[PDB]
């Protein structure tokens, strides 16, 4: 059995929570807290280990952008620090190709990154790769066909509907078809050879619309929208379904967890998190 892990988040301040949901029985497990609270981080799994990458610790007495990479071992219930990134990256996007973690964009104070770096767990090292064509904070990242897609975000001036593709073998980025909607802080994931972009912020409101990119036709098509408008949501895929966790709807930090079934094109509320929060890092193992 696999669990959906949710790490960090924000509710009045950045959080340390690490909790795991079991879709088979609806139970939530309270696991060991992160050593440093963080929101706007991204989660991922490599070799059965959960990684929490970047983010920011917003505390009522000061904010700190994070360049940290922390590793959680489910067998020991222990977090261990890993080599930090070259720069702090809040509102980051993460993708895994061949057991290597790609940390994409994000912010560091007044800086909106276009830089991308790759982590090698076997060596415990980070190395910069080719930067994106566009600076992107709150970027959605998805791995499809061994290519890394960077979708939407905010470049410091405009929220984006554009998306680009990284070719690891060639070390280069290329623009792909832009989405129908401008989305910053959307949940981006891949399911059945399609990239889904759910929710986000279009510059005026949080979104409940969801669209998917078909690689064969290079088009984005809207599918059923979520029941709740949400930005800075967590997203993952489990047993052929998409799960969206928490987020912010413009006033409230959501506890709602929705599930998308692609066969019926429907969303449904499956559980609630123990408390409402936004900017969580999510992964399945
Ligand atoms: C104003 C502001 O951002 N805040 C004041 C200082 C602390 C900080 C604060 O409250 N952040 C917490 C955490 O949220 C994330 O982790 C988070 C994670 C990933 C992406 C994004 C994201 C960023 C920019 C845009 C875009 O503008 O295009 C869209 C999405 C966010 C921010 S979601 C907005 C919400 C907010 O503004 N208020 C006031 C509660 N922020 C949050 O939930
Ligand atoms: Cl933030």
Curated annotation (Swiss-Prot):
User: What modifications does the entry list under PTM / processing?
Assistant: Non-enzymatic covalent modifications of reactive cysteines by electrophile metabolites inactivate the BCR(KEAP1) complex. Accumulation of fumarate promotes the formation of cysteine S-succination (S-(2-succinyl)cysteine), leading to inactivate the BCR(KEAP1) complex and promote NFE2L2/NRF2 nuclear accumulation and activation. Nitric oxide-dependent 8-Nitro-cGMP formation promotes cysteine guanylation (S-cGMP-cysteine), leading to NFE2L2/NRF2 nuclear accumulation and activation.
Give the domain of life. Answer: Eukaryota
Compartments reported by the entry:
Cytoplasm; Nucleus
Keyword Cytoplasm tagged? yes
Result for mutant: residue 26 to S = In a NSCLC cell line
Summarizing the annotation, the consequence of altering residue 9 to C is:
In a NSCLC cell line; strongly reduces interaction with NFE2L2/NRF2 and reduces repression of NFE2L2/NRF2-dependent gene expression
Question: Kelch repeats at which positions?
Answer: 3-48, 49-99, 100-146, 147-193, 194-240, 241-285
Q: Recall the GO molecular function terms of this protein's record.
A: disordered domain specific binding; identical protein binding; RNA polymerase II-specific DNA-binding transcription factor binding; transcription regulator inhibitor activity; ubiquitin-like ligase-substrate adaptor activity
UniProtKB keywords: Cytoplasm, Host-virus interaction, Kelch repeat, Nucleus, Repeat, S-nitrosylation, Ubl conjugation, Ubl conjugation pathway
What's the main place this protein lives? cytoplasm
Function summary: Substrate-specific adapter of a BCR (BTB-CUL3-RBX1) E3 ubiquitin ligase complex that regulates the response to oxidative stress by targeting NFE2L2/NRF2 for ubiquitination. KEAP1 acts as a key sensor of oxidative and electrophilic stress: in normal conditions, the BCR(KEAP1) complex mediates ubiquitination and degradation of NFE2L2/NRF2, a transcription factor regulating expression of many cytoprotective genes.
Q: What is known of its domains?
A: KEAP1 contains reactive cysteine residues that act as sensors for endogenously produced and exogenously encountered small molecules, which react with sulfhydryl groups and modify the cysteine sensors, leading to impair ability of the BCR(KEAP1) complex to ubiquitinate target proteins.
Q: What is this protein called?
A: Kelch-like ECH-associated protein 1
List the range of the whole protein covered here. 325 to 609 of 624
